[PDB]
Design a protein around this ligand. Structure first.
Ligand SMILES: O=C1N[C@@]2(O[C@H](CO)[C@@H](O)[C@H](O)[C@H]2O)C(=O)N1O
Ligand SMILES: O=C1N[C@@]2(O[C@H](CO)[C@@H](O)[C@H](O)[C@H]2O)C(=O)N1O
Ligand SMILES: *Cc1c(COP(=O)(O)O)cnc(C)c1O
Ligand SMILES: *Cc1c(COP(=O)(O)O)cnc(C)c1O
Lengths: 830, 830
């Protein structure tokens, strides 16, 4: 059937009875009233059963051996569905497929019922998920720590061409994967004030919110290792949240508990944008405060909570603990770690600081200013008074270090301050992370360099040793084996299976680049993938597409810097050219654009309306026929990504050079047999460098060109004046060609494009369509297109998160990865 | 060990492995980190396993045979713990005891970990629970329908002698008994307006709240029948509760979902008191609207949703459905049933009314005015506009019936109206229930008569056939076998086990009234029970009592009509007499008073402070010694009741004649070997009538005496003037003898007692202490005290809820009870 494992005689039989056990005893249903949803759950529970055994021994193991522990703090974990992934990592896919078949059910139909764990916005959240999978696969004693939002990223609905947001009640029917651990609930404080008494400061008169942990298992790939992802939930204490007496109402007191519990209610839907709301800050401290207590508790036990030097010496803390900050969201972990060490454990400042810096590491994910976290002091002042005092003290000492290194450099001092003066004083979380971490890293080579040359230049001059790079990657398991079993099979037919946990081995495929059979096969799976997607489209969304056309897709969050608008201009151009010479042949294309716009991002929501507007015109023009279709992919999410990417021919990664930190969707497309048209931005540079620029469609300004243009000054009018095709499009928008009933509907877009384009869309227009012509040319030559594909796929190895994690492990955490199978799952009950 | 069933070889082995299965796979724990709470859950899950098989066949059975269905609507279901009760009804107690013993655990210690299902205030809620157990035991196709509050009755804490309320988070660690059924979620409407168009009225522009059902199994006693208790939970729709666009904030929209979900958040803590809050009304319509849709759906399927006359003829509705209204809380079911039938199904008014009246039955639970539900019209007008129109129409037609029966009786007309004029117009829910039901019943003979003679006299004259009586009862399973296995064993040793489901058989114990062995045994278990309780007291609450003294206990909600105050006066009297003649012998007593006071009931909270105040003085007077102890039983609840009642010697049921509808605690004490001192009120009358007045300690005014006194006019001063002992107590309170630091602390109590005692406490004082002397006299003669006990126990049979339910079944529902064992639980998987 494929290499989804063995469909053993004994195990298929075993699976079936357990499926029935759960349908009866767990779901309390009988075959006569069970619905597909019930069947999905019976299975989920049956599969979940197979990894609890391993989960328990893994955790027990780490307790015995006591290795250095890795704590990945992130406010986002974009997990997606987990049924299939679990079957794959446990080599259960074929057995389950067989068993469910014998039970008369279609496993695939059941998998579609699982809701997505959308506790993330996009790239940042998904990276965290891929990392977790890789850390488990590499045998690291790692724990993912986050917030268990009851409402993840909103579900996107397109009404009249507009995006409509609606709550994502992913827990409505329950989550068979998590395990509530109410017995490990911890308290978290807010507000209050600071008392300075005799021997130390005291954080007093605080409001308490409880943090209840929920554990979700993270299985490594076929190595019997199952790590843990701990998500915190906010719960109100039953005392003060009722006990603070003297009139108000008993009923009201109980109803008001949903005020402390609102902390973990919903994820903020912003991608690459900072919103200074109190609720957000509360979420940030919540996950940090709770997690740290859990980290220290585990440390106090270790082998110190037995003997060792005997005396809670936190000197070995950094030798046993490593906490990675996914962006600045969990930045409060630094001043919080100090608070505990200094205020509670009573360590001297300097000893505490040394420990803190040695255990903390920060990862930066963007360079755009509006995404940078700068919290107003009055907020920190009210909500976390002691933390503010600690930050000021950290700042004081840090600046003193600077002054001593650059005597007289007074401007440098204000520039590096963690505190920003002005309208309102703010705290620059990024400066905080750099100062309190022993390593700061970028997510792509170019991005990392930009940090050193630009944004954090002063910091780099002060401590050049801190700065590193760790190019992002993706998991070959979910992003290849899971979503594209067809391609994975033919690859395995030639080079084996060892590449799933050693993607570098894909290079061996280079020697089949001229293989007639392979070329035919690679081309076959892609054709099958396009047919399956074209079907899914009519199934769930309804209104036909042509599977023979070039599948041109751009899927990622909607942003001005991602330039979906640039993609739009090309589409309209294609349309106009066809309308000019109707009977001229052109390579058919189905351009698919999908992504979510943050609710408050007006421009982004305007662009979505534009895309659908274009499709309304283009898709109903009889002269165009099936040569050009414009489709907006609704509710783009992980599960949807697993469907389009494998069916894509052309991957669009066209951000303005220097704005996309790295990108990961690009990597997903490269590994699944799609060719990339893009700019020298983020990881695109390393991808082309890996596959050879001849096998990539690069175009547009490089970073330097962008800067040159900024010195000069960007004037869009020039481009409007010198390019008729471009002018023609702008006037079409301006006159309502795409919005008849509302002629001025797109005035904001035009106005912006002509007068305030921060991302110079026009500057890359010419080189973009020219480049687009080159890909159409190559598509006309199937054999050569496929050979170029084989060059990309065979060379994507470097982009596996296993590589990235191995680097973090060695160069930052100080731990050695291991592909050693944990001693089976075997029963055991001590 | 006892008759808690057989500890079979095969089953104890089977139990143990399943216990382990759950500890591992369900709880995801290993023996090395498992805590008592974990062990309790492993067991709970293991036990729950044994009744899902029976649960499924029971429900399937009712689907095949299609009998008349009984729907018990109540806003309260005071369930308590359910582990032990389930073991008892399934004959699993000894096997589980053995198995857990072999696993090295103390079952009793684990049972104490289970949280109480406190979804009730007191008597009314507990009755519902006992009924459910009896309906299952009698093989009725009955369903308990209610609200799944996430916060039940508050947990009571005594701080400085005062009651402190704190949220009862009973779901904190989960509820292993319930089964969420999100797939059966129903919509419920609120607000909106009424459109009258061509063919009918339409309820429009309503706000929607979803109702999610949760099923809890209700096992009959050893008959393999497992009925269902369906509790609704409020859930917000994800559309409009987000989709009603045009600014407000996406985050705020999501946080605001906890506004529609507040409906099922908390139970109103009022007992015998009406609070006209909108939230309460919302809870009432919520449970009614959801339940009815479920009732009709089930009906539409029946055997009509196949063939029959073919044409949704609701003529057979009453032959297939019976809905019992537990008090007026679910009264909206009447106008709602009409709404559906008339508005949606399109039946003519008269046909709809005939059906409604024929399927609805109302049970009244109190006669005090402040407990009567009278909803302001402006509230119904805003929240349920169509229902108001229906009520007015029901009223119109009803009054027309009255006018026709009593021509010219204009005062009768305004008296019987469902609508009450005055300050604000109100709707008398009680009048509504009488008019729309085919039967109205009281809960005790005297209470039922009072309804006919007083409160509902006019209604009785109009339709004398509607009025009946159904004396309350309690379940012998939980209230005897479960809480007093010792007494149950010795009874079974002589007369067998058939009495557990046929309590009348207890009469056979009369012939052992002179049996020397029995007398010794009955006396022995009571001594063991008192020793166990005296221990529990020092264990969990700490501060000693004497197990040789008379256990004088009064446990029930705190009310002015229950007269805990009268009990207080006696206690102080005993104290004063001892202080007068220290070296005179008196029968030692431990008087225990416990109960919860509604948060807003100032007087009730004042009485609690008084009780503790008395104990502070009495319990620390060296001259008193161990002859007199005053203890306030904290957080009285079902689980606590199961501990005190079996250890009680004297049961206090001293309400003012005519105020306690029936009472059930009284019955609990009678069946557990305690003697009763009380007034001729509620079921007390029937109890003494059953055991013979010579075996009861009756005292005080009868109902007639109370009325005579009211004609005359009640003046407390008289009693104050003629009784020195009484005067002495009042002046002690007035001068701060019991409240040194705050001398005027009890001025409200004294003031009330002297000037506004609605329950004439003073009027029964003399006869009460005199009577109390008689019980002390009898306690001095162990042999005779025990013989009188045997007379009570042997004669309590009539007070089993099996008797009550059998009467409801035959005289109201039109169904025949059956003690037929359902065809085993045996596997089966069709
Ligand atoms: O704030 C960010 N930064 C992002 O991080 C991702 C993972 O590092 C990068 O691949 C992406 O290029 C960057 O924009 C991202 O997707 N979001 O939301
Ligand atoms: O409103 C009432 N009515 C009550 O109903 C119980 C069950 O019918 C009766 O036994 C009790 O006497 C009556 O007060 C009760 O306990 N509450 O709260
Ligand atoms: C991988 C992924 C992303 C990131 O895409 P980029 O192209 O790097 O912005 C965002 N959303 C989903 C659902 C993804 O799977
Ligand atoms: C039985 C019971 C009641 C009712 O007691 P009465 O004496 O009838 O008022 C109230 N609370 C609990 C916990 C009970 O078990």
């Amino acid at each position: 059937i494929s290499v989804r494992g063995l469909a053993g005689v004994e195990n298929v039989t075993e699976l079936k009875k357990n499926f029935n056990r759960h349908l009866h005893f767990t779901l309390v249903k009988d075959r006569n009233v069970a619905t597909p949803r019930d069947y999905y759950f019976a299975l989920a529970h049956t599969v979940r059963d197979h990894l609890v055994g391993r989960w328990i021994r893994t955790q027990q193991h780490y307790y015995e051996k006591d290795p250095k522990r890795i704590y990945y703090l992130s406010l986002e974990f974009y997990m997606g569905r987990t049924l299939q992934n679990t079957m794959v990592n446990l080599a259960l896919e074929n057995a389950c497929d067989e068993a469910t078949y014998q039970l008369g059910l279609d496993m695939e139909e059941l998998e579609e019922i699982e809701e997505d764990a959308g506790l993330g916005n996009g790239g940042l959240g998904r990276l965290a998920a891929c990392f977790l999978d890789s850390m488990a696969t590499l045998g690291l004693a790692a724990y993912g720590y986050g917030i268990r939002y009851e409402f993840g990223i909103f579900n996107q609905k397109i009404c009249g061409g507009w995006q409509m947001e609606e709550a994502d009640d992913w827990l409505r029917y329950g989550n068979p994967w998590e395990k509530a651990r109410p017995e490990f609930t911890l308290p978290v404080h807010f507000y209050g004030r600071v008392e300075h008494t005799s021997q130390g400061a005291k954080w007093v008169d605080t409001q308490v919110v409880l943090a209840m942990p929920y554990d979700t298992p993270v299985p490594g790939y076929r190595n019997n290792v199952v790590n843990t992802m701990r998500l915190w939930s906010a719960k109100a204490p039953n005392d003060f949240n009722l006990k603070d007496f003297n009139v108000g109402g008993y009923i009201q007191a109980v109803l008001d508990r949903n005020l402390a519990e609102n902390i973990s209610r919903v994820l903020y839907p912003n991608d690459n944008f900072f919103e200074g709301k109190e609720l957000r800050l509360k979420q940030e401290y919540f996950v940090v405060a709770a997690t740290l207590q859990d980290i220290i508790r585990r440390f106090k036990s270790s082998k110190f909570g037995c003997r060792d030097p005997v005396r809670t010496n936190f000197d070995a803390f950094p030798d046993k603990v490593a906490i990675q900050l996914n962006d600045t969201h969990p930045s409060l972990a630094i001043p919080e770690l100090m608070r505990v060490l200094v205020d509670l454990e009573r360590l001297d400042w300097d000893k505490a600081w040394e420990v803190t810096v040695k255990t903390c590491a920060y990862t930066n994910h963007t360079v755009i200013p509006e995404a940078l976290e700068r919290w107003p002091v009055h907020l920190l002042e009210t909500l976390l008074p002691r933390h503010l005092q600690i930050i000021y003290e950290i700042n004081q000492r840090f600046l003193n270090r600077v002054a001593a290194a650059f005597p007289g450099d007074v401007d440098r001092l204000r520039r590096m301050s963690l505190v920003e003066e002005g309208a309102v004083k703010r705290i620059n979380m990024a400066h905080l992370c750099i100062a309190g971490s022993h390593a700061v890293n970028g997510v792509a080579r170019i991005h990392s360099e930009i940090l050193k040359k630009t944004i954090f230049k002063d910091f780099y001059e002060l401590e050049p040793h801190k700065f590193q790079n760790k190019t992002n990657g993706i998991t070959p398991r979910r992003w290849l084996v899971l979503c594209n079993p067809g391609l994975a099979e033919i690859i395995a037919e030639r080079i084996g299976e060892e590449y799933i946990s050693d993607l570098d081995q894909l290079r061996k495929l280079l020697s089949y680049v001229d293989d007639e059979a392979f070329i035919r096969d690679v081309a076959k799976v892609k054709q099958e993938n396009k047919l399956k997607f074209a079907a899914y489209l009519e199934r769930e969304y309804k209104v036909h597409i042509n599977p023979n056309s070039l599948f041109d897709v751009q899927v990622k969050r909607i942003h001005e810097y991602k330039r979906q608008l640039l993609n739009c201009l090309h589409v309209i151009t294609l349309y106009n050219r066809i309308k000019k010479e109707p009977n001229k042949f052109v390579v058919p294309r189905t351009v698919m654009i999908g992504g979510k716009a943050a609710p408050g991002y007006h421009m982004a929501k305007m662009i979505i309306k534009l895309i659908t507007a274009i499709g309304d015109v283009v898709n109903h023009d009889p002269v165009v026929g099936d040569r050009l279709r414009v489709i907006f992919l609704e509710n783009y999410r992980v599960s949807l990504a697993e469907k389009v990417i494998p069916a894509a021919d052309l991957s669009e990664q066209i951000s303005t050079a220097g704005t996309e930190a790295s990108g990961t969707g690009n990597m997903k497309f490269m590994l699944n047999g799609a060719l990339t048209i893009g700019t020298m931005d983020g990881a695109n540079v390393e991808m082309a460098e890996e596959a050879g620029e001849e096998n990539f469609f690069i175009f547009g300004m490089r970073v330097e060109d962008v800067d040159r243009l900024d010195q000069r000054g960007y004037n869009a009018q020039e481009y409007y004046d010198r390019i008729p095709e471009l002018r023609q499009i702008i006037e079409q928008l301006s006159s309502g060609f795409f919005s008849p009933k509302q002629p001025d509907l797109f005035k904001d877009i035009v106005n912006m494009l002509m007068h305030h384009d921060r991302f110079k869309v026009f500057a890359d227009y010419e080189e973009y369509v020219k480049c687009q012509e080159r890909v159409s040319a190559l598509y006309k030559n199937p054999r050569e297109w496929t050979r170029m594909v084989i060059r990309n796929i065979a060379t994507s190895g470097k982009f596996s998160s296993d590589r990235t994690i191995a680097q973090y492990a060695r160069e930052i955490w100080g731990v050695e990865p291991s592909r050693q199978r944990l001693p089976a799952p075997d029963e055991k009950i001590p």
